[PDB]
Amino acid sequence: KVFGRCELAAAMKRHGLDNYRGYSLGNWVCAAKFESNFNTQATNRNTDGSTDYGILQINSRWWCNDGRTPGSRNLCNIPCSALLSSDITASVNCAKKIVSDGNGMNAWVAWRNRCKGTDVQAWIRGCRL
């Protein structure tokens, strides 16, 4: 599913991400934009042999099981295929673990390259929220 920007922003707010761990909703929308371009089906195979899944590009080395990643753990306790669905619940619940794991939103490399320290309040513009 490819979300619309405010459609995703509403979905995320409904799942408790606005100011979660002090991070504005705009931070979350900016990261999903630069991680997956709002597409729930996006995957990236890394050289690691790991793959990033879904709208927030969660990695299979630590967070979800895809059964092809050497030395993977499954900290979110889900199959990585569940992170490819049109409903964002599984992705958001896992992202809530990842953001509290100790590097805040620095865990998403596209957030730190394109969103960190910018006016992220621009990503929520025109969203009736």
Curated annotation (Swiss-Prot):
Its main location: secreted. Coiled coil: none annotated. It catalyses: Hydrolysis of (1->4)-beta-linkages between N-acetylmuramic acid and N-acetyl-D-glucosamine residues in a peptidoglycan and between N-acetyl-D-glucosamine residues in chitodextrins. It is found in: Secreted. Keywords: Allergen, Antimicrobial, Bacteriolytic enzyme, Disulfide bond, Glycosidase, Hydrolase, Secreted, Signal. GO terms for cellular component: cytoplasm; endoplasmic reticulum; extracellular space. GO terms for biological process: cell wall macromolecule catabolic process; defense response to bacterium; defense response to Gram-negative bacterium; defense response to Gram-positive bacterium; killing of cells of another organism. The active site is at E35, D52. One of its GO terms (molecular function) is lysozyme activity. Pfam families: Lys. In the egg white and polymorphonuclear leukocytes. Its EC number is 3.2.1.17. Substrate binds at D101. Disulfide bonds join C6-C127, C30-C115, C64-C80, C76-C94. The keyword Secreted applies. PROSITE patterns: GLYCOSYL_HYDROL_F22_1 (PS00128), GLYCOSYL_HYDROL_F22_2 (PS51348). It is an enzyme of class 3 (hydrolase). Residues 1-129 form the C-type lysozyme domain. Monomer. Lysozymes have primarily a bacteriolytic function; those in tissues and body fluids are associated with the monocyte-macrophage system and enhance the activity of immunoagents. Has bacteriolytic activity against M.luteus. PANTHER family: LYSOZYME C. Belongs to the glycosyl hydrolase 22 family. Lysozyme C is capable of both hydrolysis and transglycosylation; it also shows a slight esterase activity. It acts rapidly on both peptide-substituted and unsubstituted peptidoglycan, and slowly on chitin oligosaccharides. This is Lysozyme C. It comes from Gallus gallus. The lineage of its organism: Eukaryota, Metazoa, Chordata, Craniata, Vertebrata. The gene is LYZ.
